Design an enzyme around this catalytic site. Structure first.
Site, PDB file in Angstrom:
ATOM      1  N   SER A 171     -34.524  19.757  97.457  1.00 23.99           N
ATOM      2  CA  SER A 171     -34.730  18.838  96.624  1.00 23.99           C
ATOM      3  C   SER A 171     -35.290  17.490  97.282  1.00 23.99           C
ATOM      4  O   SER A 171     -34.941  17.485  98.410  1.00 23.99           O
ATOM      5  CB  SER A 171     -33.351  18.876  95.764  1.00 23.99           C
ATOM      6  OG  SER A 171     -32.626  19.813  95.856  1.00 23.99           O
ATOM      7  N   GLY A 172     -36.298  17.058  96.567  1.00 23.02           N
ATOM      8  CA  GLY A 172     -37.093  15.856  97.459  1.00 23.02           C
ATOM      9  C   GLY A 172     -37.920  15.996  98.324  1.00 23.02           C
ATOM     10  O   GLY A 172     -38.669  15.189  98.670  1.00 23.02           O
ATOM     11  N   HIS A 195     -33.056  12.242  92.036  1.00 21.57           N
ATOM     12  CA  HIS A 195     -31.856  12.834  91.920  1.00 21.57           C
ATOM     13  C   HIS A 195     -30.876  13.227  93.214  1.00 21.57           C
ATOM     14  O   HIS A 195     -29.560  13.278  93.241  1.00 21.57           O
ATOM     15  CB  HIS A 195     -31.774  14.263  90.995  1.00 21.57           C
ATOM     16  CG  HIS A 195     -32.510  15.321  92.028  1.00 21.57           C
ATOM     17  ND1 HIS A 195     -33.562  15.895  91.807  1.00 21.57           N
ATOM     18  CD2 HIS A 195     -31.703  16.381  92.802  1.00 21.57           C
ATOM     19  CE1 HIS A 195     -33.699  16.926  92.672  1.00 21.57           C
ATOM     20  NE2 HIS A 195     -32.623  17.040  93.359  1.00 21.57           N
ATOM     21  N   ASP A 233     -38.636  12.708  88.220  1.00 20.65           N
ATOM     22  CA  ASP A 233     -37.951  12.906  89.119  1.00 20.65           C
ATOM     23  C   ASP A 233     -38.461  12.496  90.561  1.00 20.65           C
ATOM     24  O   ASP A 233     -38.906  13.342  91.309  1.00 20.65           O
ATOM     25  CB  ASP A 233     -37.352  14.445  89.312  1.00 20.65           C
ATOM     26  CG  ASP A 233     -36.091  14.348  90.286  1.00 20.65           C
ATOM     27  OD1 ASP A 233     -35.424  13.507  90.510  1.00 20.65           O
ATOM     28  OD2 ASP A 233     -35.656  15.637  90.669  1.00 20.65           O
TER      29      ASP A 233
END
Ligand SMILES: *[C@@H]1O[C@H](CO[C@@H]2O[C@@H](C)[C@@H](O)[C@@H](O)[C@@H]2O)[C@@H](O)[C@H](O)[C@H]1NC(C)=O
Ligand SMILES: *[C@@H]1O[C@H](CO[C@@H]2O[C@@H](C)[C@@H](O)[C@@H](O)[C@@H]2O)[C@@H](O)[C@H](O)[C@H]1NC(C)=O
Ligand SMILES: *[C@@H]1O[C@H](CO[C@@H]2O[C@@H](C)[C@@H](O)[C@@H](O)[C@@H]2O)[C@@H](O)[C@H](O)[C@H]1NC(C)=O
Ligand SMILES: *[C@@H]1O[C@H](CO[C@@H]2O[C@@H](C)[C@@H](O)[C@@H](O)[C@@H]2O)[C@@H](O)[C@H](O)[C@H]1NC(C)=O
Lengths: 221, 221, 221, 221
Positions: free
Chosen positions: C176-177, C44, C91
């Site tokens: 995120s990530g 994402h 994800d």
């Protein structure tokens, strides 16, 4: 019924109060007179309680009063249709009265829907009952009624949901088993609320009667 | 906008596109022209972007092209009012353009509602934007619009919530900041979704513009 | 990372900072060096942003400054394992650097777990990243780390959840990530939060790395 | 209790069974003997019913039976502490027995918390009761127990929440008013469950006993 109003006395003569034998006005759920001998109610009402202790009171307005119009019956039998308590599915119960009611001025029946009959979003129905009139206030003596609208939000096709957007209203404890009246026909049976009564956040849930018309008919033989 | 339809080109001349300066077509947020030198949007659109990098594009339909109808501005000043990001309150921000828009066909202002003016459940509105037209393919090149209905279910008074009863539809990423047009007046701003876009269970949240009318006007003067 | 603390500089040499090329300090997602030419991250993170404009920064500590320790790479290729953005499934994304990093004290790989390797409830891991420190202070300059524990509550087996039982702490925007390391192995990738950061009511969610191990290794050819 | 187990007979001698007077084994709620004359229960247990119909049974194990350890009491008075049925707040009720219990081998009191005393997330406790033990299985005959962990996930501070991490288990109907015992001290009273029993989604909610410690003391004496 929270935020609804007093029905005209006997204006909905198919209205049944489920009480405990020997303790008058001990209303615990509604029901609906569908036949002189059968009350249609919620399967969840009849759990937590043995049949023999049940008392179906017909033709009332004020259930905690000795009305001349009141007619009392005990349970000869009950029939279920795969009630799922976990999922709150098939919350429907047919109660067979000890004796057939005397269909009089204040005691009548109501029509069933057609099997698989639809009740669209926006349908205006009437919901009624002797249930709690606010989660923190002593119960309701008199039958209350409330105009509601069928909605599809936060709902399951299994049920019929209703909502009162304009105000703090909806079904409350005691209203269980009661009928949802749409165009003279009973389309729903008070099944459940979410969290509480009149949250203004979720619809009130009703068993979708049209699902079970074929069963009810075959059960009445 | 999910499940929406393309607007007629320049039918919504107050639609502003917040882009990244130097990267044409870099729409990240929507905004609304309410004064020739002021764009209204969500405070949350400018959380992780410095003012100076913002390019406000008016006159568009297809934001992924340099249309002759467009007019671009940089940001002069931004104004906010007690934005609470953890509770998602007061998600409102006024961007004063570097220079006044030259009102034409494709660029025009929208009127603000009155302070504390109400928007009831059932009010039929329009939402529009260049956000993802789903989480399955890219965002919108051309302006998308969606007829929505204000709802109060699973909502909070601080916000105006909307929902599209029948289908998978709603605002999505990129629609943040755009207007909620009800009766040709801007009543809300795309603020937030719950979980994802077009959950079909949750309503879309919008800042309720009528709350800040006085602040807005006071600032515009 | 909310309620976390600053990591000792370069004490997490597999930490990657994902940025906009040309715009230094523009950290927008985390990454994890798992191989000289491969950064493992969330799908994402590169949804909107084109590969061309991404800049993978390795060896950082304060991403908002030039550091002799940092090494920049561009995105040669990216790999996806069927990302479902509506269900928030899979994800994960593999970024192949345009050139192999030069492993050092400041830049090293981190091992992967075995395919389907479980990470049981109660398992203590470290989450880290340069995300928002709470949506109140502007994003982390220096690496922040936080002690978290795996939980099964309000979760999905497809994900790995974490919760910091005794403090307002959790992963935030920008994390995120990034990696969730348990016993010096990477077990998850910061995938999403519910509502916002550090709700104190929902566990944080991470991609369950042990699920895509074979795919990963194979992609490493 | 769902997914719990049978307590050893009379191993929890402070357990009370609230039944309907004149209805042998008509258990509807739990209670905790905190003094020879006072039983601790939930305020919602005595909402529906009136106090002159409440039978408080001590020294029980199988509630259905006429056990030689059972002492039956009547309600002499009741005490509330601003109960909020709307928000499910202050769900605590002190019952004065018509007479003191004869503290025997199978009838004993339980110690109270200190005022404002914390019960942290992760604290291991025992929840017990004769409530429904399975949605289509009746309510317990004999006292059931279950180890549960105190959780802060999906909860509020007014309450103590608990969850059994990997098993469909938790409190259920008829468990209301019972005690949450942690380190041999009553810390909670079964207040509510969300949606149903053992959803494995929501924690079970208990009245936080320590908030009312001071009120119970003065009320006792
Ligand atoms: C409230 O509903 C009243 C009665 O409703 C009608 O009759 C009931 C039994 C149902 O069959 C229902 O479907 C019908 O609409 C109406 O007379 C009245 O219009 C409604 N009140 C308002 C002001 O909404
Ligand atoms: C959808 O809405 C169309 C436009 O809506 C009207 O104009 C917009 C800008 C708003 O101000 C809104 O409040 C008005 O309702 C209508 O022409 C149309 O009736 C709606 N479409 C349908 C089929 O629901
Ligand atoms: C927090 O964790 C510190 C480090 O955690 C361990 O090392 C990291 C890299 C992970 O592999 C993690 O899974 C291990 O638990 C511990 O040294 C430290 O004592 C912990 N502190 C507290 C206060 O929990
Ligand atoms: C479950 O609990 C049993 C007893 O619990 C202990 O004593 C009770 C009365 C409480 O005060 C509680 O806080 C104590 O933990 C234990 O014998 C048993 O080991 C427990 N099970 C687990 C999984 O540890």
């Amino acid at each position: 019924i929270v935020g609804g109003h007093e029905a005209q006395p006997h204006s909905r003569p198919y209205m049944a109060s489920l009480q405990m034998r020997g303790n008058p006005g001990s209303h615990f759920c509604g029901g609906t007179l569908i036949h002189p001998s059968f009350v249609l109610t919620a399967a969840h009402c009849l759990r937590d309680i043995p049949q023999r202790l049940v008392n179906v009171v017909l033709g009332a307005h004020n259930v905690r009063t000795q009305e001349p119009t009141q007619q009392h019956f005990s349970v000869a039998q009950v029939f279920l249709n795969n009630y799922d308590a976990e999922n709150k599915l098939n919350d429907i119960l047919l109660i067979q009265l000890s004796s057939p009611a005397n269909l009089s001025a204040s005691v009548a029946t109501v029509q069933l829907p057609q099997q698989d009959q639809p009740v669209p979003h926006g349908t205006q129905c009437l919901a009624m009952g002797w249930g709690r009139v606010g989660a923190h206030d002593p119960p309701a003596q008199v039958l209350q009624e409330l105009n509601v609208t069928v909605v599809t939000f936060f709902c399951r096709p299994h049920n019929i949901c209703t909502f009162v957007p304009r105000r703090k209203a909806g079904i409350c404890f005691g209203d269980s088993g009661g009928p949802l009246i749409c165009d003279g026909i009973i389309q729903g049976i008070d099944s459940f609320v979410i969290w509480g009564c009149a949250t203004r956040l979720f619809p009130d849930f009703f068993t979708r009667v049209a699902l079970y018309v074929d069963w009810i008919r075959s059960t009445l033989r």
